[PDB]
Amino acid sequence: GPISEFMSTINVEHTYPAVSSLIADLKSRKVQGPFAVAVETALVMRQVISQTRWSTVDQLIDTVRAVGSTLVKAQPTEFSCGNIIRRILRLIREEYQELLKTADEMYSSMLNLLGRPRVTGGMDMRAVIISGIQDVIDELDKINTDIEVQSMDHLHSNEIILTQGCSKTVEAFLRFAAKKRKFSVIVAEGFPNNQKGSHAMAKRLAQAGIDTTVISDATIFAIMSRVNKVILGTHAILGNGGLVTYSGAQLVAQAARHHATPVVVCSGIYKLSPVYPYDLESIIQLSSPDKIMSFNEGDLISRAEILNPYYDYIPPDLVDLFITNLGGYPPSYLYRIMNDTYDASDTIL
């Protein structure tokens, strides 16, 4: 149930100009990446709540759910968008539900099977809804700050760390331990898509006083034998605990398992999406052949299939530890983390 049915698009425009604008920038992929998408989605939702007027609570919920739905289908593999939507939806229900308690005078799912089969429903919840939304936007700005501090428990002197591509979270993680401890980091370029980003990050790691080595993706297996830990960033973490990450990460994860090297993942909880990876064919996106084969190679591109995926998938069993802003947890416990941050109904948006 998208927003087209509820209202004409022409006035999902004058009533919600931020939504139609975000949908456009999401499809064209001008606003891309987990963090950027998350922030912009939250901001758009803020002016949606700011301008929507929904007097029983169910009009709000239906509005945000429908508006969030079209934001999801604009660019379905940017799961951070849908996650923000699910947060705000639980923000309303719980807050309102708490409001319901305010007027005066489950706990198992299994037990329910034998279970048994409003007053002043209200608007002007805006103040608290906008509050919690602004909070979320803030809590997004603190992810690196309270993640990097956990590096003193996993990064030690003279250890060798393998990482791939560019991750601002991982970079922060490394540099925070780098101030007091001197170690080594091998940066595998994320060719062809995370190439420049990783090359740039590698320079800064070196400037931070870290013994940085830059290797091609083919060299990953060759140096795995002298690597203590693998530290990876991720684009998204799905419902089963699997990783939607940037291409080439499978090389690292597989080579790590083979050499019995631990795989650590640093990621904010906002990248944790409840959607189940039914078909990986829909999850992996493909960019232009341009990044791999040059266009002036007329004969080659005419006689060959050139494929450039910029997403890789890691099964949840190849991740030993998740470093999050909520702390360090095994892939197993991600199950309960989702149950605490999302309402189960919002799994399909």
Binding site: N158, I160, E189, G190, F191, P192, N193, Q195, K196, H199, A200, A202, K203, L205, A206, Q207, G209, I210, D211, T212, T213, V214, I215, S216, D217, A218, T219, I220, F221, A222, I223, S225, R226, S247, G248, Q250, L251, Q254, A255, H258, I284, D290, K291, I292, M293, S294, E297, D299, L300, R303, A304, E305, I306, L307, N308, P309, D312, Y313
Partner: protein
């Protein structure tokens, strides 16, 4: 001292090269010089062709070689040869195939038992150089090709990595005999030999797909067979080939895809290494500067001044040790054998 074994795990790898002829020793034969330049410059040829050119050059060496009459042919030809070798190894470290052909020639230098007029002496020598090139390389290669080709079935999706003469010959031959299949070419940085492969295979009218090694996990789901050419086959059954080959074999194993190693017998070695780091060949770190799509197109890179930057080091290994458990079958001119039976063949010479 001439030695430097430090905290750098790459400190022991021979990085010294000779790029020009400046101050070249005087006793070096012209044909040896040009070979030294091409070995140290070309992107285009590997162990098989390296060995052929090395031998044919040494015939010219011995042919133009003039006996001094303070001694005669047997004691001093081996010394003059040693001079040419010392220069060649300074331009580029000897391949296993080259080193084995060297032991062959040096042995046959000695066994001629103070016999003949030298000219007859030269005459045979070129014979088993001619015969070594004939039997051990060319004839054997043709045997491997037909042995490997009959393993190809209609509907096969075959993966070849980089640019391998042996594997290329197998594929080309396969379509010539009218086998219905398509080839998946996996390429890698810094230089892209897979393009030379893709160029060749599409000019022979073979259906081809082209991806980078970062997209290995993705493209592997289409692959039914993997064919590998080898620089050398280790005595423990391990395959010693190009830097990304183990990753090919590892992910191939995870997708239940047969790993087929195609190596001539004379490239077998007594050497056994337990990792890819003890015995390898360093490639120029500046190769990793080029931003990706092309090489030698002159793009500057963030990493261009990495030589001057402290804690920043660029690195590209040329080779890779693929464990025996990841090789399904080894195809030589002795037939299809378990890779572990390599040291047995060395006894049958």
């Amino acid at each position: 001292i001439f030695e430097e074994k430090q905290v750098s795990i790459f400190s022991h790898l021979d990085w010294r090269r000779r790029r020009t002829t400046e101050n070249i020793p005087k006793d070096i034969h012209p044909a040896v010089i040009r070979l030294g330049l091409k070995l140290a410059n070309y992107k285009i040829f590997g162990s098989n062709q390296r060995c052929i050119d090395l031998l044919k050059t040494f015939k010219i060496v011995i042919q133009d070689y003039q006996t001094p009459y303070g001694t005669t042919l047997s004691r001093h030809l081996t010394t003059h040869i040693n001079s040419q070798i010392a220069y060649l190894v300074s331009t580029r470290p000897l391949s296993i195939s080259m080193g084995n052909a060297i032991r062959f020639l040096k042995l046959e230098i000695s066994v001629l038992d103070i016999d003949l007029t030298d000219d007859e002496g030269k005459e045979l020598l070129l014979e088993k150089i001619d015969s070594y090139i004939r039997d051990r390389i060319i004839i054997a290669g043709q045997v491997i090709v037909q042995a490997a080709t009959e393993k190809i079935q209609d509907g096969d999706v075959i993966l070849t990595y980089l640019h391998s003469s042996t594997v290329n010959d197998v594929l080309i031959h396969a379509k010539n005999v009218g086998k219905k299949f398509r080839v998946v070419v996996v390429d890698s940085r810094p230089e892209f030999e897979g393009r030379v492969c893709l160029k060749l295979l599409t000019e022979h009218g073979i259906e081809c797909t082209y991806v980078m090694i970062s997209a290995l996990s993705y493209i592997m789901q289409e692959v039914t067979k993997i064919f590998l050419g080898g620089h050398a086959m280790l005595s423990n059954g391990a395959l010693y080939s190009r830097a990304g080959t183990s990753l090919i074999s590892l992910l191939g194993h995870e997708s239940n895809v047969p790993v087929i190693a195609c190596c001539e017998s004379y490239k077998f070695t007594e050497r056994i290494q337990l990792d890819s780091l003890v015995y390898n060949e360093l490639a120029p770190g500046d190769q990793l500067v080029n931003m990706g799509v092309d090489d030698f197109e002159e793009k500057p890179g963030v990493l261009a001044n990495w030589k001057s930057v402290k804690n920043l080091k660029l690195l590209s290994l040329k080779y890779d040790v693929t464990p025996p458990r990841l090789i399904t079958v080894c195809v030589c001119e002795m037939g299809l054998l378990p890779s572990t039976s390599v040291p047995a063949i060395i006894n049958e010479f």
